[PDB]
Enzyme design. Sequence first.
Site, short mmCIF file in Angstrom:
data_model
loop_
_atom_site.label_atom_id
_atom_site.label_comp_id
_atom_site.label_asym_id
_atom_site.label_seq_id
_atom_site.Cartn_x
_atom_site.Cartn_y
_atom_site.Cartn_z
N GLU A 221 -17.92 -13.04 36.13
CA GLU A 221 -17.23 -14.31 36.02
C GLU A 221 -16.17 -14.46 37.10
OE1 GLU A 221 -16.69 -17.52 33.19
OE2 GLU A 221 -17.31 -17.15 35.27
N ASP A 222 -15.79 -15.70 37.41
CA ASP A 222 -14.76 -15.91 38.41
C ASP A 222 -13.36 -15.88 37.80
OD1 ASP A 222 -15.28 -18.50 37.31
OD2 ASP A 222 -14.96 -19.50 39.24
N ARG B 31 -15.37 -24.96 46.38
CA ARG B 31 -15.95 -23.70 45.93
C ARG B 31 -16.35 -22.79 47.07
NH1 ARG B 31 -17.43 -24.19 40.33
NH2 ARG B 31 -18.13 -26.28 39.77
N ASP C 66 -9.91 -17.61 31.13
CA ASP C 66 -8.70 -18.32 30.77
C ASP C 66 -8.60 -18.36 29.25
OD1 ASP C 66 -6.72 -20.27 30.37
OD2 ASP C 66 -7.34 -21.41 32.15
N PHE D 25 -2.64 -23.82 39.97
CA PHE D 25 -3.83 -24.68 40.02
C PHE D 25 -4.62 -24.09 41.19
CE2 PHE D 25 -6.80 -27.97 40.39
CZ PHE D 25 -6.63 -28.93 39.41
#
Lengths: 185, 185, 185, 185
Positions: C105-106, C171, C109, C158
């Site tokens: 996964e990147d 991306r 959260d 962010f």
Amino acid sequence: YFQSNAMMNQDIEKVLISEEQIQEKVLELGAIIAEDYKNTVPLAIGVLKGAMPFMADLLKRTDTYLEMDFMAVSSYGHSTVSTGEVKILKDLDTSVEGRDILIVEDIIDSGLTLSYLVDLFKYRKAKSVKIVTLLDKPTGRKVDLKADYVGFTVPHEFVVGYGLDYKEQYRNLPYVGVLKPSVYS
Amino acid sequence: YFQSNAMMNQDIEKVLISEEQIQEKVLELGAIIAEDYKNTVPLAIGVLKGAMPFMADLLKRTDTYLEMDFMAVSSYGHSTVSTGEVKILKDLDTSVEGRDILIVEDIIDSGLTLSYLVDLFKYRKAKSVKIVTLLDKPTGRKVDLKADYVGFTVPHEFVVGYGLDYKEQYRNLPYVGVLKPSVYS
Amino acid sequence: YFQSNAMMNQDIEKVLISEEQIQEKVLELGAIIAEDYKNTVPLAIGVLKGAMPFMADLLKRTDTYLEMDFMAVSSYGHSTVSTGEVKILKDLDTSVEGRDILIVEDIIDSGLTLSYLVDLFKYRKAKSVKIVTLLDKPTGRKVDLKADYVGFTVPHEFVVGYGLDYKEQYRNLPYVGVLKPSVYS
Amino acid sequence: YFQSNAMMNQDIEKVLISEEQIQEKVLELGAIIAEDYKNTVPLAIGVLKGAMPFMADLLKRTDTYLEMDFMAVSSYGHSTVSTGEVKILKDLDTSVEGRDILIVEDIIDSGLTLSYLVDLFKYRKAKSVKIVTLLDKPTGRKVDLKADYVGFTVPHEFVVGYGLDYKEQYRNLPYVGVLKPSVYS
Ligand code: NA
Ligand code: NA
Ligand code: NA
Ligand code: NA
């Protein structure tokens, strides 16, 4: 020597369950289901492609608020023969959590893939999961699974019609027939 | 003052097309399609979910060899509203090349989605592509598209039943009815 | 006054994790994973689309026999926010039963969707399920879920780049950057 | 005697294209593409699973605004060996109409599948469709198809690595190698 256009009936050994029997039974099951789901709007799910004719007739004979949805699955090979685990091609359009799920099926035989879907839905926190099947072949079981509603218990006959196919054909028959050995042997 | 469970009939202003009318028309159309596809086994496809009840009944009254398949699609937003292009969620289980495709639909209104799929099948080299729809609302077209077979041409009514829904409910009614204004506004 | 074609860098306030940092960490993590999975061929799974750049670089620096697969999922709306239950749009190409699953996964959260997938794989009888994430925002958890391998623990920024997007763009940045406020508000 | 843990390099006859060569080329192709797509935001699409390592490296060396997306397809059997028609398992997350599409692929051999997808996108009204492939085996063509950008032209070698697999393994190699006959014979 008279020769005419081929008709499906020529491939049928005999009619195992007539359309008249089917409609009589659908009327019975739909009434029972309507009573059992009186208060809540369940999610009635069908696994393509076999369940379509039965699901359509059954639900129109079920006088109660409900939602319909469908899933499409494919086999992973010989591993779909152990636990029934299948590849999801089309998942439900809405969430399972807190819903009363009614799985509508044409026939339960090994019980493998339906067993896998039932517990997947319980994993997804379904409020309940029940199964209504038109046909039940209990001697075929490879895992324990009892349907909550059953139209007919059938022996080990090669059946086609009313959703059941042989090489993707015959699903449109309005009855369940036994295929002549010649056709598949 | 007495209360009890809610019944779908309470929500219907009037029956637009009775179950008897649908069955008569399904018989009629089934016979015509069987005649037209007597020398070839076509691929009859329904786009989930609305087409099911009609597809089930129609194909049961179509006495000819044929194969069934289904597609599931979703909107891309306003770019689907403006051109028909939809996202394919479940493609056909078999190839379209060289096949006679028969799309079974519950209602054609704008014709945008159906037109996109028709030309998609032609792009995929279908031998022929025809459309049978239970209901046709020609005044709603945003693109030129005429169904090859039509059960009923309907006016400007808010309809539910026999596959048609309102917030996913009512698809199980055995007739096409006009929903009371109160329910959707 | 001189204008010209726009460049992504103009939109980045600051580099949070440089390409040089990511590469050093990928080398480290790939060596650890290779050691941990040296005696088994695990199934390394990435959930589209964010995990791709990281999964490509990570697996390249992971010198061991392994298989890659990917899933695509979508939200069910306000029922994916309180469960993590998502709609499966593309399932795994191979079965989960008996396999050691490694989710790449990147960023983690809330941990909601990932937790849903983990327990889905356990329902599917995975032998083991582990998670390697490039970035971790532990303060955002809505469910208890700790990654087995973490590249960087990040604060309240962010971020975009290296798989992370803002309206599907950015991306492709080779680093993780903080987007200037102007761009998203 | 000396027996060590199995390493992928032991299955490799030789390195056909090194990691060094690959990175040098990606840097070149990325610069050309960034220039060619300077003013617009193209939709860069990869067909799972082979295209992933290359698409990841290429797009991060492409300094321009772009959107990434992916498709998953499966064969229909022998009919996927005529026109290249494939079953769509995962369609694009956004519409094709009016978009500049850039298909990123690991290798073009027969050209069948990519030819079908290119013309599918033109059918969906793409503003343009181009192809960038890491490897090209031009003698393998079964349909006419020239990629717009090509990393390397390779002869008829059994290749694995950098997305290319043998029994789903080897995709994680950071180079392109020739598999020892022993392994697949
Ligand atoms: Na109900
Ligand atoms: Na026929
Ligand atoms: Na291994
Ligand atoms: Na651009």
